[PDB]
Design a protein around this ligand. Sequence first.
Ligand code: 5P8
Ligand code: 5P8
Lengths: 288, 288
Amino acid sequence: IENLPAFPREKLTLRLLLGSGAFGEVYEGTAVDILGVGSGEIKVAVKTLKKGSTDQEKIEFLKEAHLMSKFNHPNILKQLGVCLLNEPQYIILELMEGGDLLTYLRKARMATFYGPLLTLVDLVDLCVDISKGCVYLERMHFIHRDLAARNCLVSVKDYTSPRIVKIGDFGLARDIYKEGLLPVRWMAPESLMDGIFTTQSDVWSFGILIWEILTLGHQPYPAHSNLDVLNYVQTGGRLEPPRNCPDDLWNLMTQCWAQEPDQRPTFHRIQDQLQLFRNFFLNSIYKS
Amino acid sequence: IENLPAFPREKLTLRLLLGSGAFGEVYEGTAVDILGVGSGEIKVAVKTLKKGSTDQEKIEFLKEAHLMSKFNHPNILKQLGVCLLNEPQYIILELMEGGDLLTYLRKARMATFYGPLLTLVDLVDLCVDISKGCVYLERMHFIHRDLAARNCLVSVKDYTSPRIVKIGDFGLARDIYKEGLLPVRWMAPESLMDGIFTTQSDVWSFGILIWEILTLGHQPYPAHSNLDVLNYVQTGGRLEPPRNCPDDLWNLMTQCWAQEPDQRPTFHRIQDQLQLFRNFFLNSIYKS
Ligand SMILES: C[C@H]1Oc2cc(cnc2N)-c2c(nn(C)c2C#N)CN(C)C(=O)c2ccc(F)cc21
Ligand SMILES: C[C@H]1Oc2cc(cnc2N)-c2c(nn(C)c2C#N)CN(C)C(=O)c2ccc(F)cc21
């Protein structure tokens, strides 16, 4: 019997507004003893469901909350509690003070032209993090269907402390134990043409994700309007390689965008390739 | 009664050779219970005094050991023990697995042209570290007289874990409570011309040090032979600013190389300026 973690609305204080997500509104706040009796006023994020909103939207809201209760993995955003008896509904998430990956990446590049505040090893660690999360989703028979940096989160705001990224928005995730959409730049050709979604289209999008990471948050297909994108892609056109991107990481990405879905790597292999490259590169610098 | 920390030569095992420093030989090894009874086989570095070497050199060796016993500060290399009853003499230092700052800087720049493995904030933290060490030496009435990246050490080999640099070679340090030399590129004009050394010539050299940090270990005055350097400097010539070096840090460096020794900043002000710039820059990125 699946149970969402009920949490006393009284012990929750909404302090900062972080943005307007969904329908829709997210706040930083504090929640007493979320982590237990020896917790304190630990900071949290709060996802809210607007009052009076569609009965259908409330269901999507509840769907999300259920997906996140089900998941338990270091690279998957934690849902710490819910407030569902009173409106507005609250989904209480662990606070990721670095905000969304995309923003965290772009601040890193734009902070000083002395150089990015994230290095190649930093970026490889981000990729390794998200890929573990993908391994996990696959093992749980879930397809995320919207893998992109805007949908991941970073645990710290600064660029010096140890950091972790997590997948953090499962509004489109689907169980696959057996008229909307938008993000054309992340979608596999099968998905755009035939409306088909699989773990292998997730692999296409992870390819785009790690491209986003390696460019520090550039827009895919910068010279193409949304409309031209599907032309471009459907052709056989692919993104340009990031400036000075390691050949190993380009070959991985490239294979993620195999036209033929069964010619793409698996998530396990993708994580292997990422860990393999990291060790190679670490070893490489020390022997210098 | 000044006492060097005597340590049982038996509990020491010389494993790796790290290089040949002084007269002269340094090893990585392990030393049982250096940190106390609950220590274990903790890794150390070992500075050795060659057998049969000059009676005078042994004195310089002993001088160093005494200087380092006297000092206790987070940014000054720890001397953990000595082996002075038997030859070869051993000075047992905490291991700084990043090696010397200069090498650590150059590996950072040469590891991938995707970008340096040290960012501006990393480098500013290095400068802040060494400047605290300089504040301390001054407060102890000591002049180091050879401040340079080759003479500092980094606590870790990788470029991700928290790191600290320390001043680590006091072969030339002098107490100032009241025919050798070489490093012309680090020496104040008074020092080269008149053989004069003060805390203010130390400030000149720290200027050069932080230049070394900000260029990731480039040689000062690259277009000048050692001979031409004193001409160049004695004129009024100064180093070029590092590529994309923050204006605040250029103004600091520049002032460290004031022709007139009393027109140079103090170490306290230098540390203030460094901490002030760091906060400004951190604040700067977040509000972006
Ligand atoms: C549901 C929401 O959750 C969080 C948001 C933040 C931190 N931690 C969590 N859990 C956050 C953001 N920006 N900033 C400055 C902070 C902070 N601190 C991003 N944001 C406004 C979002 O709406 C968003 C975006 C993507 C995603 F996957 C979840 C979320
Ligand atoms: C006296 C010596 O001490 C140490 C050396 C090292 C680490 N920790 C300590 N204490 C070290 C070095 N390289 N590498 C790879 C390691 C390691 N691990 C540098 N080196 C060979 C030096 O001789 C040297 C240079 C400058 C300085 F200030 C002290 C020293």
